[PDB]
Amino acid sequence: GMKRLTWISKFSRPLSGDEIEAIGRISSQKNQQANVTGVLLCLDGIFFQILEGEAEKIDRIYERILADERHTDILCLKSEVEVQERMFPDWSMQTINLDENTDFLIRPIKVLLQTLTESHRILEKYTQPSIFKIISQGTNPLNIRPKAVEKIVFFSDIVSFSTFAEKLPVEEVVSVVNSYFSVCTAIITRQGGEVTKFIGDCVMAYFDGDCADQAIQASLDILMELEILRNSAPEGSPLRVLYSGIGLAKGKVIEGNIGSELKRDYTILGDAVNVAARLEALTRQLSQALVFSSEVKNSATKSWNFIWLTDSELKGKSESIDIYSIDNEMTRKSSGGLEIARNIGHYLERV
Amino acid sequence: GMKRLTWISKFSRPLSGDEIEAIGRISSQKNQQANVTGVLLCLDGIFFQILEGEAEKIDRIYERILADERHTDILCLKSEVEVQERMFPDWSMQTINLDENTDFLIRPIKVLLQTLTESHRILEKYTQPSIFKIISQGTNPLNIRPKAVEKIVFFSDIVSFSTFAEKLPVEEVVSVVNSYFSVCTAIITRQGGEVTKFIGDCVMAYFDGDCADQAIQASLDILMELEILRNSAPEGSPLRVLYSGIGLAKGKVIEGNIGSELKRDYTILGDAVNVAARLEALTRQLSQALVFSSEVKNSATKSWNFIWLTDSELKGKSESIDIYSIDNEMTRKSSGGLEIARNIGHYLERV
Numbered sequence: 001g002m003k004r005l006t007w008i009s010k011f012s013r014p015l016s017g018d019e020i021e022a023i024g025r026i027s028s029q030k031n032q033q034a035n036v037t038g039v040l041l042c043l044d045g046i047f048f049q050i051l052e053g054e055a056e057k058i059d060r061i062y063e064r065i066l067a068d069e070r071h072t073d074i075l076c077l078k079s080e081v082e083v084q085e086r087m088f089p090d091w092s093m094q095t096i097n098l099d100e101n102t103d104f105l106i107r108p109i110k111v112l113l114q115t116l117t118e119s120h121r122i123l124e125k126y127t128q129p130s131i132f133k134i135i136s137q138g139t140n141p142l143n144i145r146p147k148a149v150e151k152i153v154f155f156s157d158i159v160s161f162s163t164f165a166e167k168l169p170v171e172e173v174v175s176v177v178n179s180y181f182s183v184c185t186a187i188i189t190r191q192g193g194e195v196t197k198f199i200g201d202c203v204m205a206y207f208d209g210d211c212a213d214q215a216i217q218a219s220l221d222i223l224m225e226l227e228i229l230r231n232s233a234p235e236g237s238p239l240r241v242l243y244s245g246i247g248l249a250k251g252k253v254i255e256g257n258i259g260s261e262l263k264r265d266y267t268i269l270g271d272a273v274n275v276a277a278r279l280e281a282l283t284r285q286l287s288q289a290l291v292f293s294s295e296v297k298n299s300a301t302k303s304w305n306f307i308w309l310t311d312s313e314l315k316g317k318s319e320s321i322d323i324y325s326i327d328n329e330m331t332r333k334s335s336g337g338l339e340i341a342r343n344i345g346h347y348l349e350r351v
Numbered sequence: 352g353m354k355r356l357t358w359i360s361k362f363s364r365p366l367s368g369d370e371i372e373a374i375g376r377i378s379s380q381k382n383q384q385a386n387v388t389g390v391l392l393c394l395d396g397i398f399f400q401i402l403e404g405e406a407e408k409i410d411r412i413y414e415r416i417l418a419d420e421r422h423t424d425i426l427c428l429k430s431e432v433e434v435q436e437r438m439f440p441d442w443s444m445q446t447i448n449l450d451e452n453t454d455f456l457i458r459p460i461k462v463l464l465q466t467l468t469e470s471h472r473i474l475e476k477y478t479q480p481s482i483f484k485i486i487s488q489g490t491n492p493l494n495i496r497p498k499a500v501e502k503i504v505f506f507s508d509i510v511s512f513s514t515f516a517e518k519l520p521v522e523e524v525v526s527v528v529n530s531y532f533s534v535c536t537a538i539i540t541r542q543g544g545e546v547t548k549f550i551g552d553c554v555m556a557y558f559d560g561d562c563a564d565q566a567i568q569a570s571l572d573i574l575m576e577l578e579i580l581r582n583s584a585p586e587g588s589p590l591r592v593l594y595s596g597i598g599l600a601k602g603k604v605i606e607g608n609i610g611s612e613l614k615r616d617y618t619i620l621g622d623a624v625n626v627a628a629r630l631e632a633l634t635r636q637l638s639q640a641l642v643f644s645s646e647v648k649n650s651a652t653k654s655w656n657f658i659w660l661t662d663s664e665l666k667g668k669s670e671s672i673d674i675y676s677i678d679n680e681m682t683r684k685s686s687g688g689l690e691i692a693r694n695i696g697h698y699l700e701r702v
């Protein structure tokens with residue numbers, strides 16, 4: 001079984017023609033020893049490479065490439081497994097510096113390559129990070145076979161978000177929600193989860209069905225980071241009254257090629273909207289920044305400081321489920337809902 | 352003011368080398384008369400072109416190109432306004448057939464171009480169709496200045512979607528939801544709206560703030576198409592018990608560069624989740640497939656057969672708003688909610 005990788009990256013810093021040449025030289029020497037072939041091109045501070053060989057050797061080489069200080073933002077665009085024929089059998093690593101190339105026909109191709117790479121970067125930011133996950137594992141997302149998988153589903157929202165929109169300039173509202181989305185997404189990702197979408201002011205994320213500990217850790221880490229954010233913001237910053245509620249439940253989600261050819265999606269949680277709205281209501285009603293179902297609680301392996309809060313319905317069936325939180329100094333909180341909303345409005349009014 | 356367009360398309364059918372040559376010839380002759388310059392490349396059934404000239408002439412030429420039978424799926428990747436210098440001053444239209452090119456350095460570039468175009472096609476399906484809208488109007492989406500704009504917001508969902516997941520194989524569930532998403536998205540788009548996201552089984556869409564008539568027409572068209580779908584499906588098809596509820600409200604949405612660098616979005620409706628859940632609950636409680644607020648009703652200019660149904664809250668404030676629907680043969684419907692859910696389960700159980 002032969003493997004072929006295509007990837008693109010950005011120069012981590014400015015790189016001379018002689019430095020690019022040196023990259024291609026050691027790459028060629030190492031790949032020759034590995035029986036690996038391919039091509040490396042650069043244009044306007046972007047590297048493109050196709051790399052092909054026995055899968056074991058490719059991954060070790062690829063692991064090395066990801067650690068090179070000379071580039072960053074490495075993106076695997078295609079991974080072919082069980083490759084049958086080499087594209088570049090005579091090139092251990094052929095290097096093509098397009099910046100130095102002045103050939104008649106290659107000039108318009110460089111403009112096209114540039115524009116297409118830039119367009120591609122724009123699209124990267126607007127798609128689920130899981131889509132690139134599927135690609136690096138050798139699968140076209142549009143060919144995923146449908147499957148049902150149990151997940152821990154994460155929902156956070158901003159407390160009385162409507163007050164921000166009523167009290168602040170639109171640019172400042174966006175600043176606040178960007179700070180919120182950035183905190184949530186960074187922490188969820190480092191705990192091994194995936195943000196699947198933003199729904200208004202609400203972040204939706206998945207954790208593997210048996211990673212409750214990571215979903216709880218992520219939730220507490222977010223609450224702690226938001227407390228630090230509120231306390232460390234400048235005087236009069238709107239960030240001082242940025243609060244979140246977080247709910248966790250278990251759901252069976254559907255993975256597959258989902259949607260309308262116009263618009264596609266990789267996953268659906270049926271009735272996500274109702275689960276999110278119900279968790280939102282529980283954080284408000286309970287004055288508790290973190291709530292989660294018994295199914296989440298019993299999936300956890302660590303000895304969290306669990307506290308039982310109440311019964312509720314999360315799915316819409318006539319099933320009363322126990323709602324828990326974590327009892328820690330942070331989550332101890334006497335009045336939420338209307339109390340916090342009034343405070344937010346008073347503060348933001350005088351900003 | 353000079354304009355420059357970069358676009359890609361797919362051959363609508365197989366095209367010979369001599370036919371591609373003829374395209375480039377008339378393009379060159381017409382552009383010479385228009386004082387327009389550029390380059391056209393083709394590779395493996397894809398056209399790429401850069402076109403540059405006075406904006407008026409470019410658009411007329413571009414309008415012609417969109418109507419050519421010889422290609423389809425035309426996608427503008429970049430539109431530069433107030434261009435200062437031509438890229439290709441000596442080329443009215445230079446044609447470069449990469450399929451016929453066998454040059455040493457161009458072979459790896461063709462592989463890269465191919466892979467990058469394919470990757471780009473995958474990403475196209477997973478991003479808001481509005482993102483490409485912003486690009487063709489000459490703006491990088493990641494540079495949008497934040498703005499607040501009033502919209503008609505559309506929310507539809509599948510009635511007792513959870514029964515499908517409980518009664519059917521996962522592949523058939525996906526079939527059903529794909530049929531649903533395809534109907535909704537096609538009709539919303541032809542009525543001038545934009546689907547912004549799928550949230551579980553729920554479609555979220557915007558119409559311009561004063562296009563209530565189009566949002567109502569789209570809603571009725573979807574209900575009519577689903578009725579036709581249920582009636583025309585084969586015996587035992589799960590599509591026979593595919594029902595939708597639809598809610599419309601007015602909201603102020605925020606447009607801008609929104610999200611977490613990891614994940615970006617072009618728009619947020621604050622508390623979208625709560626508005627959607629409330630409309631979902633109203634369609635259930637009222638046994639009415641279409642509900643909408645008085646703000647939507649009074650925004651309509653046509654003389655719809657409006658019927659007043661009840662008061663509700665949609666936003667969470669202590670504001671009681673009148674809920675309306677359209678009284679027509681279709682929407683006349685005696686029992687929903689638990690009635691329909693039981694029917695769906697019985698039917699799907701015996702499929």
Ligand SMILES: Cc1cc2nc3c(=O)[nH]c(=O)nc-3n(C[C@H](O)[C@H](O)[C@H](O)COP(=O)(O)O)c2cc1C
Pocket residue numbers: 023026027028030031040047049051061064065066067068070071093
């Ligand atoms: C853009 C780029 C492409 C590279 N391609 C390869 C490659 O194809 N093969 C390789 O062995 N190293 C490649 N490298 C360099 C590795 O990161 C690493 O420096 C090199 O393999 C030396 O490792 P070694 O001394 O353990 O053999 C590349 C580096 C950069 C910046």
Ligand SMILES: Cc1cc2nc3c(=O)[nH]c(=O)nc-3n(C[C@H](O)[C@H](O)[C@H](O)COP(=O)(O)O)c2cc1C
Pocket residue numbers: 374377378379381382391398400402412415416417418419421422444
């Ligand atoms: C891939 C492709 C690129 C084209 N590019 C141009 C072009 O740059 N300029 C142009 O006038 N026509 C171009 N055309 C053709 C137009 O669609 C149209 O056939 C042509 O302009 C003749 O119009 P006319 O007789 O009114 O001048 C292109 C067609 C295709 C399929």
Ligand SMILES: [Ca+2]
Pocket residue numbers: 157158159160161201280622
């Ligand atoms: Ca909220």
Ligand SMILES: [Ca+2]
Pocket residue numbers: 310311320321322
């Ligand atoms: Ca109980």
Ligand SMILES: [Ca+2]
Pocket residue numbers: 271508509510511512552631
């Ligand atoms: Ca539903």
Ligand SMILES: [Ca+2]
Pocket residue numbers: 661662671672673
């Ligand atoms: Ca009333």
